[PDB]
Scaffold this active site. Structure first.
Site, PDB file in Angstrom:
ATOM      1  N   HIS A   1       0.811  -1.344   0.103  1.00 56.01           N
ATOM      2  CA  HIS A   1       0.073   0.159   0.147  1.00 56.01           C
ATOM      3  C   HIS A   1       0.955   1.059   0.016  1.00 56.01           C
ATOM      4  O   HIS A   1       0.511   2.257  -0.873  1.00 56.01           O
ATOM      5  CB  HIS A   1      -1.009   0.033   1.278  1.00 56.01           C
ATOM      6  CG  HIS A   1      -1.860  -1.286   1.234  1.00 56.01           C
ATOM      7  ND1 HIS A   1      -2.582  -1.746   0.522  1.00 56.01           N
ATOM      8  CD2 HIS A   1      -1.634  -2.263   2.279  1.00 56.01           C
ATOM      9  CE1 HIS A   1      -3.259  -2.926   0.896  1.00 56.01           C
ATOM     10  NE2 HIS A   1      -2.628  -3.010   2.006  1.00 56.01           N
TER      11      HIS A   1
ATOM     12  N   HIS B   1       4.954   6.775   7.191  1.00 61.91           N
ATOM     13  CA  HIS B   1       4.798   6.377   5.753  1.00 61.91           C
ATOM     14  C   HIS B   1       4.383   7.901   5.180  1.00 61.91           C
ATOM     15  O   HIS B   1       4.067   8.759   5.638  1.00 61.91           O
ATOM     16  CB  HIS B   1       3.862   5.362   5.822  1.00 61.91           C
ATOM     17  CG  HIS B   1       2.421   5.738   6.308  1.00 61.91           C
ATOM     18  ND1 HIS B   1       2.134   5.484   7.338  1.00 61.91           N
ATOM     19  CD2 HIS B   1       1.369   6.256   5.507  1.00 61.91           C
ATOM     20  CE1 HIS B   1       1.028   5.937   7.735  1.00 61.91           C
ATOM     21  NE2 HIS B   1       0.739   6.532   6.553  1.00 61.91           N
TER      22      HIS B   1
ATOM     23  N   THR C   1      -6.618   6.486   7.834  1.00 58.63           N
ATOM     24  CA  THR C   1      -6.832   6.744   6.284  1.00 58.63           C
ATOM     25  C   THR C   1      -7.011   5.473   5.597  1.00 58.63           C
ATOM     26  O   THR C   1      -7.363   5.595   4.419  1.00 58.63           O
ATOM     27  CB  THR C   1      -6.360   7.724   5.906  1.00 58.63           C
ATOM     28  OG1 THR C   1      -4.988   7.509   5.735  1.00 58.63           O
ATOM     29  CG2 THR C   1      -6.247   9.245   6.611  1.00 58.63           C
ATOM     30  N   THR C   2      -6.590   4.381   6.056  1.00 57.67           N
ATOM     31  CA  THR C   2      -6.646   3.095   5.630  1.00 57.67           C
ATOM     32  C   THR C   2      -7.509   1.923   6.291  1.00 57.67           C
ATOM     33  O   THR C   2      -7.610   2.155   7.571  1.00 57.67           O
ATOM     34  CB  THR C   2      -5.434   2.588   5.145  1.00 57.67           C
ATOM     35  OG1 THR C   2      -4.619   2.072   6.260  1.00 57.67           O
ATOM     36  CG2 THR C   2      -4.425   3.380   4.413  1.00 57.67           C
TER      37      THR C   2
ATOM     38  N   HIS D   1       2.841  10.839   7.386  1.00 56.80           N
ATOM     39  CA  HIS D   1       2.300  10.674   8.343  1.00 56.80           C
ATOM     40  C   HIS D   1       3.167  10.003   9.573  1.00 56.80           C
ATOM     41  O   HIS D   1       3.835   8.856   9.200  1.00 56.80           O
ATOM     42  CB  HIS D   1       1.244   9.768   8.121  1.00 56.80           C
ATOM     43  CG  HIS D   1      -0.013  10.202   7.532  1.00 56.80           C
ATOM     44  ND1 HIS D   1      -1.030   9.548   6.624  1.00 56.80           N
ATOM     45  CD2 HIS D   1      -0.091  11.645   7.333  1.00 56.80           C
ATOM     46  CE1 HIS D   1      -1.720  10.355   6.150  1.00 56.80           C
ATOM     47  NE2 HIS D   1      -1.217  11.563   6.578  1.00 56.80           N
TER      48      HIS D   1
ATOM     49  N   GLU E   1      -3.641  13.437   1.350  1.00 59.73           N
ATOM     50  CA  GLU E   1      -4.864  13.072   1.925  1.00 59.73           C
ATOM     51  C   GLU E   1      -5.956  14.204   2.426  1.00 59.73           C
ATOM     52  O   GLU E   1      -6.791  14.227   1.960  1.00 59.73           O
ATOM     53  CB  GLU E   1      -4.682  12.010   2.924  1.00 59.73           C
ATOM     54  CG  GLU E   1      -3.808  10.813   2.324  1.00 59.73           C
ATOM     55  CD  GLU E   1      -4.148   9.412   2.862  1.00 59.73           C
ATOM     56  OE1 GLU E   1      -4.149   9.589   4.118  1.00 59.73           O
ATOM     57  OE2 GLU E   1      -4.840   8.536   2.408  1.00 59.73           O
TER      58      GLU E   1
ATOM     59  N   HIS F   1       1.731   9.182   1.515  1.00 57.79           N
ATOM     60  CA  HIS F   1       0.787   8.883   0.503  1.00 57.79           C
ATOM     61  C   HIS F   1       1.295   9.941  -0.537  1.00 57.79           C
ATOM     62  O   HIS F   1       1.729  11.125  -0.217  1.00 57.79           O
ATOM     63  CB  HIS F   1      -0.493   9.227   0.973  1.00 57.79           C
ATOM     64  CG  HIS F   1      -0.964   8.570   2.332  1.00 57.79           C
ATOM     65  ND1 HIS F   1      -1.899   7.322   2.177  1.00 57.79           N
ATOM     66  CD2 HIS F   1      -0.692   8.885   3.327  1.00 57.79           C
ATOM     67  CE1 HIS F   1      -1.991   6.893   3.488  1.00 57.79           C
ATOM     68  NE2 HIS F   1      -1.222   7.695   4.124  1.00 57.79           N
TER      69      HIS F   1
END
Ligand SMILES: NS(=O)(=O)c1ccc([N+](=O)[O-])cc1
Ligand SMILES: NS(=O)(=O)c1ccc([N+](=O)[O-])cc1
Ligand SMILES: OC[C@H]1O[C@@H](O)[C@H](O)[C@@H](O)[C@@H]1O
Ligand SMILES: OC[C@H]1O[C@@H](O)[C@H](O)[C@@H](O)[C@@H]1O
Ligand SMILES: OC[C@H]1O[C@H](O)[C@H](O)[C@@H](O)[C@@H]1O
Ligand SMILES: [Zn+2]
Length: 257
Positions: free
Chosen positions: A61, A91, A195-196, A116, A103, A93
């Site tokens: 992911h 991590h 958020t996942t 994040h 995000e 995004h």
């Protein structure tokens, strides 16, 4: 399984994770005009000087840089937080192009990426117990824009060729996450969620106002990662962001006047 594609992306997650339509989902758009200064917020303390990074993992992911969280080596305190929150991983995004990838959004504007830094509340003993609590987690979010290179990101960039595919990991000791911060700690905060999947509503979000700048070359290397495993058809790891969710019965508070 869940992902970011047309057939398994954010619009599908609710079928296996019904909290996706919950009252406290993240990310959100940050309307800077409606966000209100909150004098009750205490000074924010990002205390990362004794951080112990361990490993970097492509989980299919994103990639996680993992930390030793067996003691209070790297912690977040203050601000909206009651108690001590221990850094477990960070991590990012990011997008397929520089015009999307974050995000959270700021007055609807999308940044190229978002970092994040994930922390858990030590009063609950372990991350797994923390994600059963309304105040179990604190995520420090930092926007990335494309401009000058971020020197403290380069070690991350340069290891990505060794974790190209899902399930690969590499040693990643002696990495200092302080090199990923902007100058200012001004922030917005609100209560939200992961958020996942599993989308759990356990997070105090602290989103810094000042983005960091990274170079085009740095973000282009993020986009060479793969969602797929070794030997499988290549699916570039891009656009691994969830769009903004309804604010519902929440207010976003600002640390600054
Ligand atoms: N709800 S989900 O996003 O975890 C999900 C989407 C699609 C499939 N699928 O197509 O098999 C499975 C699971
Ligand atoms: N993207 S995030 O920071 O809200 C996030 C952190 C941790 C997990 N997790 O542990 O499953 C999921 C998502
Ligand atoms: O090696 C990365 C970092 O590790 C930390 O534990 C040290 O205290 C820092 O001085 C160092 O920059
Ligand atoms: O009732 C007045 C209060 O309304 C709340 O929604 C706001 O968060 C407070 O800042 C304000 O003092
Ligand atoms: O600090 C993270 C990593 O940066 C570089 O890849 C170093 O060569 C490696 O030893 C270290 O683990
Ligand atoms: Zn995240």
């Amino acid at each position: 399984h869940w992902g970011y594609g047309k057939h398994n992306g954010p619009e599908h997650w609710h079928k296996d994770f019904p909290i996706a339509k919950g009252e406290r989902q993240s990310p959100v758009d940050i309307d800077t005009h409606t966000a209100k200064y909150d004098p009750s917020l205490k000074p924010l303390s990002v205390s990362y000087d004794q951080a112990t990074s361990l490993r970097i993992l492509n989980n299919g992911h994103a990639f996680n840089v993992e930390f030793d969280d067996s003691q209070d080596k790297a912690v977040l305190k203050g601000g909206p937080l009651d108690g001590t929150y221990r850094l477990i991983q960070f991590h990012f995004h990011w997008g397929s192009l520089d015009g999307q990838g974050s995000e959270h959004t700021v007055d609807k504007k999308k940044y190229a990426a978002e970092l994040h830094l994930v922390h858990w509340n030590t009063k609950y003993g372990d991350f797994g117990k923390a994600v059963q609590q309304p105040d179990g987690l604190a995520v420090l979010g930092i926007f990335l824009k494309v401009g000058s290179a971020k020197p403290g990101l380069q070690k991350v960039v340069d290891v990505l060729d060794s974790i190209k595919t899902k399930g690969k990991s590499a040693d990643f000791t002696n990495f200092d996450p302080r090199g990923l911060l902007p100058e200012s700690l001004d922030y917005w905060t609100y209560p939200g969620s992961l958020t996942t999947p599993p989308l759990l509503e356990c997070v105090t979000w602290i989103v810094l106002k000042e983005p960091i700048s990274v170079s085009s070359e740095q973000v282009l290397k993020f986009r060479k990662l793969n969602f797929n495993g070794e030997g499988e058809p290549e699916e570039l790891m891009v656009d691994n962001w969830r769009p903004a969710q309804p604010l519902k019965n929440r207010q976003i508070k600002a640390s600054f006047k």
